[PDB]
C-alpha cells in the first residue's frame, strides 16, 4: 500500500529542497513532522505541507491509519525553469534561471505482527 502527494511547480531550486527531503527519507510520519518542524531551511515549509497531505490521503482515502504510517519514499524533480535577464556591467546582460521543483512524497504502513 501507499499514499502519494506530489506538489508540482513549487519554485525553489531542487538541490535546495532535496536537502530537507533526504532528512526524512524513510521515517515515522510522527517524527518527520517534528523534524521539519525545527529544521531551519525553506524547504521545510514546502516538504512539510506535502508530507502532511500524503498523511491525509493515506487516511481519508486509503484507510491506512495515521499511527502506523511513515515515509515509504520521497524525492524531488526539476520543473520548467523561469529564465530572467540580469543587467550586467558594461551592458553584458545574463539570463538567471529561477529554477522550480516537483516534490513527491509517498507514505506507507510500517508493520503488523
Amino acid at each position: 500500500m501507499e499514499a502519494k502527494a506530489i506538489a508540482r511547480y513549487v519554485r525553489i531550486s531542487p538541490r535546495k529542497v532535496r536537502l530537507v527531503v533526504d532528512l526524512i527519507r524513510g521515517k515515522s510520519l510522527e517524527e518527520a513532522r517534528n523534524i521539519l518542524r525545527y529544521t531551519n531551511k525553506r524547504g521545510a515549509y514546502f516538504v512539510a505541507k506535502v508530507l502532511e497531505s500524503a498523511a491525509a490521503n493515506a487516511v481519508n482515502n486509503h484507510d491506512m491509519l495515521e499511527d502506523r504510517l511513515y515515509v515509504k519514499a520521497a524525492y524531488v524533480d526539476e520543473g520548467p525553469a523561469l529564465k530572467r535577464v540580469l543587467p550586467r556591467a558594461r551592458g553584458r546582460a545574463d539570463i538567471i534561471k529561477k529554477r522550480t521543483s516537483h516534490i513527491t512524497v509517498i507514505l506507507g504502513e510500517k508493520h503488523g505482527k
Binding site: 536537502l19 530537507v20 533526504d22 532528512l23 517534528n34 523534524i35 529544521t39 531551511k41
Partner: peptide, 9 residues
C-alpha cells in the same frame, strides 16, 4: 560533506 543534519529535539 553537504548532507544536512537532523535538528536535536
Amino acid at each position: 560533506h553537504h548532507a544536512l543534519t537532523p535538528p536535536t529535539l
